[PDB]
Amino acid sequence: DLRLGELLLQKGWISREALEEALVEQEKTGDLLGRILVRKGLPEEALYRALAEQKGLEFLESTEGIVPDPSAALLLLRSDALRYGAVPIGFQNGEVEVVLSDPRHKEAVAQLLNRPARFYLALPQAWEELFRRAYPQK
Amino acid sequence: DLRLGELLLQKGWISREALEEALVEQEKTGDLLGRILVRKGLPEEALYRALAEQKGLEFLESTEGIVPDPSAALLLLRSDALRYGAVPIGFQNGEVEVVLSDPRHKEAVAQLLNRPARFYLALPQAWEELFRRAYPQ
Ligand SMILES: Nc1nc2c(ncn2[C@@H]2O[C@@H]3COP(=O)(O)O[C@H]4[C@@H](O)[C@H](n5cnc6c(=O)[nH]c(N)nc65)O[C@@H]4COP(=O)(O)O[C@H]3[C@H]2O)c(=O)[nH]1
Numbered sequence: 582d583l584r585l586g587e588l589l590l591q592k593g594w595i596s597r598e599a600l601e602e603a604l605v606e607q608e609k610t611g612d613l614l615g616r617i618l619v620r621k622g623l624p625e626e627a628l629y630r631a632l633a634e635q636k637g638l639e640f641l642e643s644t645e646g647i648v649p650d651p652s653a654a655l656l657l658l659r660s661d662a663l664r665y666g667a668v669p670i671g672f673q674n675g676e677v678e679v680v681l682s683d684p685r686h687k688e689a690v691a692q693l694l695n696r697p698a699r700f701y702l703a704l705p706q707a708w709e710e711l712f713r714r715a716y717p718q719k
Numbered sequence: 720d721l722r723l724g725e726l727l728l729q730k731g732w733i734s735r736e737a738l739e740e741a742l743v744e745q746e747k748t749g750d751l752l753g754r755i756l757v758r759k760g761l762p763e764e765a766l767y768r769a770l771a772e773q774k775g776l777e778f779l780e781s782t783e784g785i786v787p788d789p790s791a792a793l794l795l796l797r798s799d800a801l802r803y804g805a806v807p808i809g810f811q812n813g814e815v816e817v818v819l820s821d822p823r824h825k826e827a828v829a830q831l832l833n834r835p836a837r838f839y840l841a842l843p844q845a846w847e848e849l850f851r852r853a854y855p856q
């Protein structure tokens with residue numbers, strides 16, 4: 582319902598002038614809005630918390646405690662896990678738990694999995710650490 | 720030596736008007752600045768990362784993988800680990816690794832331990848789960 586800029590405004594993590602400056606730049610550059618905001622000083626975690634709320638994802642402050650379930654990992658080929666930015670990590674109540682790197686990929690991943698799923702969002706470094714543990718390059 | 724408010728303002732978690740507002744409220748209520756800011760929308764994790772930076776602590780996002788070394792837990796009576804909010808979890812390079820629940824207790828704990836130490840900080844639930852693991856019963 583709410584766009585990213587409005588979400589951040591509502592949470593008090595950007596100012597109206599900071600948002601307008603970003604939207605004015607975007608209309609000249611076409612860069613992703615969150616990228617402009619972060620480049621101008623928005624904490625990257627603030628961006629991801631807002632993006633998670635927008636797509637109904639649970640934001641994961643860390644992936645270090647996750648022990649990836651090998652049987653969940655079989656639900657995506659490694660090449661697909663990397664391309665879609667999705668790590669299946671386990672099961673809860675007959676749903677597969679999946680950690681995304683980019684909320685914009687939730688729908689594409691959900692369609693692919695074609696089963697009940699619970700989605701999480703992790704920061705880039707946290708996501709890559711998790712991916713490598715779930716999908717060793719071996 | 721930056722105070723918490725300007726630490727958070729520089730990062731961009733709070734506006735300047737929100738900081739002034741929170742300190743004005745604190746003048747009436749006396750609550751901690753971090754608790755007011757968290758009530759006003761600051762993530763608790765962002766608060767603890769700033770508090771860790773301020774006191775030279777390493778903030779731990781998670782304690783789930785830590786297996787507490789019993790040899791290190793011996794360095795504090797359980798009663799002291801609870802009162803000081805400090806869990807010794809192991810040793811690195813001749814320093815004892817200690818996980819604090821509150822960065823304000825760093826100096827008191829360091830004086831007591833009286834040996835080289837590496838200090839970490841953890842959010843309350845993660846700290847409690849680690850404390851029960853290191854100091855069972
Ligand atoms: N992984 C990742 N995802 C990002 C990032 N920035 C945005 N996303 C998401 O990608 C979608 C397209 O972003 P946009 O290209 O900047 O296109 C934006 C942007 O041009 C504009 N916009 C965003 N917020 C506002 C606002 O508050 N006010 C106005 N007038 N326009 C806004 O509306 C369009 C739709 O925005 P949204 O519905 O929120 O949809 C956004 C948002 O869900 C990022 O840095 N990283």
Ligand SMILES: Nc1nc2c(ncn2[C@@H]2O[C@@H]3COP(=O)(O)O[C@H]4[C@@H](O)[C@H](n5cnc6c(=O)[nH]c(N)nc65)O[C@@H]4COP(=O)(O)O[C@H]3[C@H]2O)c(=O)[nH]1
Pocket residue numbers: 721722723724725726738742745750751752753754755770773821822823
């Ligand atoms: N466990 C926990 N610890 C917390 C929390 N908030 C602060 N601490 C820490 O406790 C000390 C006392 O916080 P305070 O009572 O709000 O008393 C504060 C506060 O009244 C004020 N203050 C803090 N930041 C600012 C600022 O940016 N500008 C101004 N003018 N005053 C500030 O200076 C005094 C000292 O602030 P600090 O040096 O940063 O020292 C702070 C900080 O290290 C919390 O929510 N939980």
